[PDB]
Each structure stands twice: as C-alpha cells, then as structure tokens.
Design a protein around this ligand. Structure first.
Ligand code: H52
Lengths: 20, 353
C-alpha cells in the first residue's frame, strides 16, 4: 500500500530542513 | 450564479473587512519593526525545568520565571555555533520578526537577552506538543480536524503575506498545539521580507515547491504549495511526495503528478490539485483573487473564518494538560549544562540581538 511505501521510505520521523 | 444576493453581499463585506484589518495590522507591524525591543531579561530570572527540544540551532527549555511563576519556552543558541553554521542573519531576522508580529496563531516572544556565550529567546510555552507527534500517533486527521488546522494556517499566511513575509518553513514539526487545541507557528529563521521574488534554496524536502527545487526566482506562492502538502499530510497521514532520498522526492514534486487516498473527498482533492499546482500561473493563492480562491473553496464552505480568528470554534482535539509546566506532550532529551564563558564570544556578529 501507499502507507507501506511511506514506512519503507525511512522518512517517517522528524524531518530536517536542507541547511542541516 | 453560485451565490444569491444575500450571500454575495455578506462575502463581499467580509472580504473588505479583511482588507481593513490587514491595513491596520501592517501599520502596527511596521511601527514595531522600526522600533524594536531588546535586553528585556536575564538568565537568573528563570528556573530551568526540562529540555523540550533540540537541534543544530541549540535547545529549547521549559523555564519558570521566578517573580511571576509563569512558565516559558526558552530557546538557547550558542553564538559560536550559530556563526559556524552560517546562521547569523537568520537568527537576527527571526528575533526581529518575532518582536514585530502579532497574531493569535503566532507564538509570542516575551523576553530576549544574550550573555558571553549564548542568545536567549523566551517565548510563551505552548504545552500541547508538536502537531507532528499527534499526527504520527493518531495516524491521520479526519477532514474536519485537518480543516480546523488548515484554516488557521490560511489566516496566518494571509496575515504574514500582507506584511510581505514569506514563511518557507511549514511542516507538522513546526506547528505546536496550545492548551485550547489551536495552532501556534514558531520558527521564523527562514522567513523573509519579499514583496517580489527571492532565490534561496531553503526548506524541507517534502514541502519544497517545484520552483524552489528548479532554482527559479520565487514568491509567496511557495507557502500556498506548502499548505497543500500540509493539508494532504494531515488528511492522509503521509505527505504527497516521498521517497528514500531527497533527489527522488524532488523528481516527484516537479512531475505534476499527485495521487490521493481513496478516502479523500472530491472537494479535498480539488483544493489540493489547485494548491499542488506546478504551474505558478494557475496555483491558488497566486491568482488575481488571491487568498479568496482558497477561503471560498468548497472544502472550506463550513469554515467560519472570523470564528476561527476569534478562537470561538471548539477544537476537535484538546491535548492532555495536567497543569502549568506539564511537559508530557513533548519528548525526553538528555539534559546538558548551559555554560557561559568568562569571555564574550562573537560580540560584533550579534551586536544587534
Ligand atoms: C517546545 C516548545 C514549546 N513551547 C514553545 C516553543 C516555541 C518555540 C519552539 C518550541 S520547540 O517545539 O522546541 N521547537 C524547536 C524549534 C525548532 N522547530 C521545532 C519546534 C518549533 C517550543
């Protein structure tokens, strides 16, 4: 599912801005 | 047409009243911007309680003001680290903006000061936690719940854009929930006064508008794109464009394709296609009718914009609150000292703070 694809992305935690 | 005479007259009057409000708010902002505040407290006026957040920026601590007993969120920045990370202008800009704005959904800066080592911005403590945490815990917000938050962002951006401020940092991580369940926006380091265009590559990958990715000059419309991302993520539980690595996210963002969960209403999908519009010439919030294309969209038909502004709508969700100083809606972090050197650091760089 799309949710499973989201989990697989590894980007489910707090996301940093570019400058970090 | 779509509106009969009474509804059309009421809507027109409401839109004219917005203009009148914003003209006064701009006058007030510019007066405060011309003549700020500074050095309004010191470290030993507060008891340090607990660390509520950390980052490359520094830390945010819950503190209690000794004289009043009021709790606050104190953001502590290490001057030498700010310099090393090339964030001098952003830090001074954040303070100047926070000092000058006034809106029910923008966090209030109560004190600021500096010492030999650090800069301190003392803001109202917003005890309900980050929208991010609640969203990941609940999974996704219902459309009415997402709409309640979205309306607050729409009004906040309508305010900021009237001041020529582009926000550029929207995401659930940067939205806090207050005791009454309303949003507080807090981070202004990347915000900029831009009447026309600007060019800096900044923001968070999932929330970047295509024109930023594509290294174009861009304008306030990037904030309306980001609103589309936020609404989508609130209602789906995940953002519209994701992948393992930012470069793959950017390819999806610029493609002009977006897909929706089957549970999204048709009204929601229509709004999102008009916010997540790659073509600037067609994006809602960037057309001749401005913010009205968003506020008058069918998905917001049940929204009483003045009632939201007045905070008279019952919030769909009230965070847990056991009393002043309750920190349970925030994570736990390792507690570190705040050392201040006997030698002033970076005095020249931060002279205006
Ligand atoms: C805990 C908290 C609580 N109350 C007010 C706050 C004001 C600003 C930042 C925070 S904060 O959430 O610590 N915080 C850190 C800054 C970087 N962006 C994420 C977020 C806005 C507050």
């Amino acid at each position: 599912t799309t949710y499973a694809d989201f989990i697989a992305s590894g980007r489910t935690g707090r996301r940093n801005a570019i400058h970090d | 047409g779509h509106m009969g005479n009474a509804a059309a007259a009421k809507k027109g009057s409401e839109q004219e009243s917005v203009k009148e409000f914003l003209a006064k708010a701009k006058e007030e902002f510019l007066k405060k911007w011309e003549s700020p505040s500074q050095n309004t407290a010191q470290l030993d006026h507060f008891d340090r309680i607990k660390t509520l957040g950390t980052g490359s920026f520094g830390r945010v601590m819950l503190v209690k003001h000794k004289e009043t007993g009021n709790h606050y969120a104190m953001k502590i920045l290490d001057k030498q680290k700010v310099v090393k990370l090339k964030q001098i202008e952003h830090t001074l800009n954040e303070k100047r903006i926070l000092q000058a704005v006034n809106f029910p959904f923008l966090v209030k800066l109560e004190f600021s000061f500096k010492d030999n080592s650090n800069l301190y911005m003392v803001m109202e403590y917003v005890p309900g936690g980050e929208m991010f945490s609640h969203l990941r815990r609940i999974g996704r917000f219902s459309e009415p719940h997402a709409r309640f938050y979205a309306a607050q962002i729409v009004l906040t951006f309508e305010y900021l854009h009237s001041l020529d401020l582009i926000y550029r940092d929207l995401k659930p991580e940067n939205l806090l929930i207050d005791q009454q369940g309303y949003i507080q926006v807090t981070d202004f380091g990347f915000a900029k006064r831009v009447k026309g265009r600007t060019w800096t590559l900044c923001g968070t990958p999932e929330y970047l508008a295509p024109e930023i990715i594509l290294s174009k000059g861009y304008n306030k419309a990037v904030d309306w794109w980001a609103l589309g991302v936020l609404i989508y993520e609130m209602a789906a539980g995940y953002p519209p464009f994701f992948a393992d690595q930012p470069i793959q996210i950017y390819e999806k963002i610029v493609s002009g394709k977006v897909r929706f969960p089957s549970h999204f209403s048709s009204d929601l999908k229509d709004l999102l296609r008009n916010l997540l519009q790659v073509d600037l010439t067609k994006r809602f919030g960037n057309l001749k009718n401005g913010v009205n294309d968003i506020k008058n969209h069918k998905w917001f038909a049940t929204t009483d914009w003045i009632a939201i502004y007045q905070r008279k709508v019952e919030a769909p969700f009230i965070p847990k609150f056991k009393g002043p100083g309750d920190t349970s809606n925030f994570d736990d972090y390792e507690e570190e000292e705040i050392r201040v050197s006997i030698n002033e650091k970076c005095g020249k760089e931060f002279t205006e703070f």
